[PDB]
Design a protein around this ligand. Sequence first.
Ligand SMILES: Cc1ncc(C[n+]2csc(CCOP(=O)(O)OP(=O)(O)O)c2C)c(N)n1
Ligand SMILES: Cc1ncc(C[n+]2csc(CCOP(=O)(O)OP(=O)(O)O)c2C)c(N)n1
Ligand SMILES: [Cl-]
Ligand SMILES: [Cl-]
Ligand SMILES: [K+]
Ligand SMILES: [K+]
Ligand SMILES: [K+]
Ligand SMILES: [K+]
Ligand SMILES: [Mn+2]
Ligand SMILES: [Mn+2]
Lengths: 332, 332, 374, 374
Amino acid sequence: AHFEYGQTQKMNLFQSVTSALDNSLAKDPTAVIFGEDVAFGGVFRCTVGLRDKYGKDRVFNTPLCEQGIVGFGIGIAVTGATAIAEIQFADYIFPAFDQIVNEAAKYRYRSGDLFNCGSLTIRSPWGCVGHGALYHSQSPEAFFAHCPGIKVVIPRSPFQAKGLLLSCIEDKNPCIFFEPKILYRAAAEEVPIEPYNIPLSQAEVIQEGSDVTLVAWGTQVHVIREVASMAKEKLGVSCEVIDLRTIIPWDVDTICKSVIKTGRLLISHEAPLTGGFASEISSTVQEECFLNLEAPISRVCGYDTPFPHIFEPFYIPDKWKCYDALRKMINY
Amino acid sequence: AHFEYGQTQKMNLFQSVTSALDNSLAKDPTAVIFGEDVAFGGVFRCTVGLRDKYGKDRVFNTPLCEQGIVGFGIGIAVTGATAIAEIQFADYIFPAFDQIVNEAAKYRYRSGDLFNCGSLTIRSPWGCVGHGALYHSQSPEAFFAHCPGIKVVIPRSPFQAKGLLLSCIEDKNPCIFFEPKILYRAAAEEVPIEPYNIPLSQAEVIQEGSDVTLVAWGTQVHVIREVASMAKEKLGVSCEVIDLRTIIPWDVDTICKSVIKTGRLLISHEAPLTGGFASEISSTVQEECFLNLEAPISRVCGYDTPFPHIFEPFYIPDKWKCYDALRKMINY
Amino acid sequence: KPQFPGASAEFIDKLEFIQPNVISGIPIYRVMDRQGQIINPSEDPHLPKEKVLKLYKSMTLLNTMDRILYESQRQGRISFYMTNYGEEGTHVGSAAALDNTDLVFGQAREAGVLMYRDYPLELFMAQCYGNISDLGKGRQMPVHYGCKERHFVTISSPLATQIPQAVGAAYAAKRANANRVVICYFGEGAASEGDAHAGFNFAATLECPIIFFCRNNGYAISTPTSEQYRGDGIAARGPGYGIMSIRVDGNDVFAVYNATKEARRRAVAENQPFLIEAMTYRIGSTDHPISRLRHYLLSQGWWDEEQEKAWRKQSRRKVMEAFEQAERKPKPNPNLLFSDVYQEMPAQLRKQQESLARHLQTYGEHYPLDHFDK
Amino acid sequence: KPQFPGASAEFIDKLEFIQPNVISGIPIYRVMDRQGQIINPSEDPHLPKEKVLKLYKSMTLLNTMDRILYESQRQGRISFYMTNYGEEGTHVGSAAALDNTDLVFGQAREAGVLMYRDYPLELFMAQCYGNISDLGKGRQMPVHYGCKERHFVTISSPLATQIPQAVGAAYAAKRANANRVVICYFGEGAASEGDAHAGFNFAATLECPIIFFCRNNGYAISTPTSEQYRGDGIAARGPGYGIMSIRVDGNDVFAVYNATKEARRRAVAENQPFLIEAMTYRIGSTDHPISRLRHYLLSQGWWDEEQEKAWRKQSRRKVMEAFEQAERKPKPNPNLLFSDVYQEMPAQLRKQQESLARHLQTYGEHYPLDHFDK
Ligand SMILES: Cc1ncc(C[n+]2csc(CCOP(=O)(O)OP(=O)(O)O)c2C)c(N)n1
Ligand SMILES: Cc1ncc(C[n+]2csc(CCOP(=O)(O)OP(=O)(O)O)c2C)c(N)n1
Ligand SMILES: [Cl-]
Ligand SMILES: [Cl-]
Ligand SMILES: [K+]
Ligand SMILES: [K+]
Ligand SMILES: [K+]
Ligand SMILES: [K+]
Ligand SMILES: [Mn+2]
Ligand SMILES: [Mn+2]
């Protein structure tokens, strides 16, 4: 392996998603959940028990057609009902790309706010999983980041996932919530049983530091946390570790306030380098923090290839890759 | 309005595309051209005369289904035949996004080079047109730039279009060639009648200069040429004007060699700022030219909105927007 | 005998391919002939005079507005237009069979549905001019209409995207115990898109109260139907999805009405989709339904040349009053290009708004600001 | 009488919706009963003994390999597997009816086609282990086979994407005067994707020599066909696209063969698509065709228990020899994760290759480099 809200229980990330979805269908009678194989509980168990609890009209399987799932969900949301669509793997979201980019994202704008699909959330498993190869490993957030009118949100843990998913479900804009699938059954943590929200477009500084800022999201936050620890131990370097959480609209202010303080930034993501979302963070931080930069902003990302099966250990931007880049940056 | 190869004739950009396609079907008996409404010559006249010259089996209409057009074209190319697919407006390429990103781009890699679709080219009208609004104005290149295995090429003129299109048709990788539609009937220029090639992944310095580098592609190259002229006249500033031409894989070396010389860079594109391809150029130049940068790299792009009808004059990154950003950069 | 889950069928012991019936396809339902005569009295809906005159005045007013706005586009006064010629009967006949609150998803050429629903001429014009009265805020291409009050979902350029959306809205209506139908219009070219296969199948498997209304005018831009499909048009595809289907004469307002009325009644009672394929002639972007209905009126003695002349004058006057008003209104404030991207403008988008405002302070002489508000 | 370009049909003067025939659907063609007996002698293909034994040995060898590789996955020796149980007859019966050079596009569960085409066991194993003998270079998930020599296009995970691709390859074969067909396999769930609607319609309108072979096993993961479609399975959709269609008993190798043989003959002669829907039982990711065919062999007196025992031993030995070899081969050099992204590695991709090589020089102790080549 490469890596105050009332009563809580230990939940892994799949359980935390089921808890968010249960809390949503309890408190919002319009809400429905649908996609491929969601009725029996889903291929990653995220919807277990929900159809028996809430009814077959509210948690149901569709035909095997992603463009249909998203179009259908838009239509539910046009009537004001909450629509929680599932795409079985983020790698299979691309048949729906036209419905997401040309339709969901533009629905409110193009109608002058006469119609909208704000009550749509699309949730999908995301990121590498050890052996998923080209089509069960992708992290497509940079393709969506270039489309005004949608929000894209990626949690790093069970507590973060439930609070960010409830915020997406309740946000009045179409949201894509990418669930890092390698975390679904990883370590549990304490998660509140009742609903709570974590704001969108807000990064979290999870460790303060003064020499360098590290930014990542999803599972890669745990990698940079470990890198911070290696840097402290091996180099005496103090790292500020930031989970971006929302890809768009992203928290420019928190990232720039950190870099103005530290003077250095390394951003890391599993997705390929070219066109990846580190490119947007880097070019924005440069513009806002130019005079503070002690060294070039570093991007440690997946290579510009499809995601391989047998070579996955060599492809991913693991803690050694991030640490070696950080060492060069400190020494620039 | 906001903006040595043998015998030539004056051609506008639609005519230059027809000339490339005619030259291709003359010299490659496998080549076929297909899409919506291509048989009668196309909605922008790019295929006029070709069906009568080459036959109904080689220039033909498909059903109205973009995902089908691209999948079909991949299949032709799997057999080794040249497949020149048309997507009627780049705004309508998104139904085919899965066939492009999950299939065409990954075809050679995932098969170990047992199969490929290198002989596919997808051509599509692109960019603003004065009044095209949300769905006849888009410039989707940044969505494709994040997908290893495809090439994306955008010409700035008739001579450039014919030479770059013939290079895409003959390149052994699936290529998307975006034709700036506002140039289709704009000024002609002299274009060779016989085939010739302009290399892919090669930028062109069209005006040398020493104080600042300006980078753009498509019609926006003419805007930055004008900006160079305003800067020379109004500010005495010497601008080096570069047409990127290939979005991916892009010519990093030419851009960085320019910025090492000038110390300043402004990149401009019609597509929205966030996630746009200026983000990749900026973050790469910063990494390679950090010590040479006299001022932050400037991106003057479309706003992060869908592309509006009545507001188009206010939306686009026109010469005044680029000039004002350049003035601030010079004064930083 | 066979026990396979995927189909209910018997065995057969001889190899026989199932052949399509294309040469003798699904027949075309007709109520009145080209002379306006009712062909089969049991099929006559015997609509009352005031309703039949509303059908005729809605189609002819749409035709009057089309002629004016088509000339306006040829002069460059609006950037684009596309007329409704040949589709007036389908637009208006079907809208008359709906309840006022049934939700409509359109395809392109739906203006007659809005006309029948009493959409003001001012508002058709405002959208085409992108002026301050457009509730769409001038953001879409002309002839992209929408109205929340009249349950007509804003049209978008991408073909067929509204088909699976309409199915979702119909599923939500079923859950709401709406007693509402959704209708979704699309052309025969748009039916080749993958989204049509998605919508047709989802509506059947999720049991949705939706009418799919396909206008088959023989062409998709330059593409004849021989290059669009090889089955018996679109109506023959419905039964393969389990959808009840019918084909109607789109030049016959009463056949369109009768089929839509019966599809609506059954879709809402049974929660099942219906497909209507209306055959027309593409008459006109930048044997007629009106003539047939006029012949009918002139039978019941319900219209005559004097009334026709007076209405032609009155309709022209109303269209021209609205056209004048539309041309003299300003365009909306350029700040409106930033709102409604999200419900709330993100701070980074507000920063871009502010940068345009600063830009116009310094460089405004270079922008066509004279007929923009504020 | 009607003159509409979009359909050939008569008028009808009564409103009648066309109802789907789902309860009595397209019947299921059968040649042999569950006891291996031929039902209708005029339908017996009377294949020669050596060919019928190749059908049986190919299915059983596939089943032997499946049992071994399924255990290998349960132990974590390979990362994924999925067996061919219940699909051996469809895979092998159809492949036997093709010419060796007809091009195959698969869907998922096509290993029997490769087995019939004498794909080495070593190479099935190499792809599942991602070892140095995999011509796929270890890049795809196990059970993603491809072979250029045997005209079997590499499989990809996204469902239905191969359907319109197969149509393009068939159009290119028609132009090349190939006298070749293309076959494209897909499941009944995959037929709900928009790409299936695209491929079916394109094949008919562009007149392509293609066999669409749908395996309907009643389920798509957990989804039964009642939630997948409401028409009469997939075969009833063919005629709506103008495609000749048939439904066959997928547990009957001879019915599959006869239908595929006749579809191939007619597709190649007529340049038209054919659809075969083979009904099976999903028996197994990480009344049987073999039993029926064994009953037949044991009739012609063509097999017996001694031969069955000897072949079961011989097949196990061959599978285990290949399994041993596959496990002891190294994985390919990690440099191979960068090649074939484009035909030529772009200089910026070469820079990333070089950066991995530098990285492994310093940090290689942290990587599982012991069974990677070089
Ligand atoms: C996805 C997509 N592709 C292409 C177009 C361009 N286009 C606009 S109308 C049209 C033809 C539509 O034909 P049909 O559906 O028969 O409608 P009709 O115009 O005949 O009413 C096309 C190709 C589009 N708007 N959307
Ligand atoms: C586009 C896409 N969506 C979802 C999946 C995940 N998935 C893999 S197999 C399967 C079910 C396929 O059912 P069917 O086509 O009937 O094939 P069968 O497994 O029964 O052979 C699904 C949903 C996928 N591979 N591709
Ligand atoms: Cl609200
Ligand atoms: Cl070559
Ligand atoms: K939402
Ligand atoms: K090419
Ligand atoms: K639409
Ligand atoms: K596939
Ligand atoms: Mn049409
Ligand atoms: Mn299945």
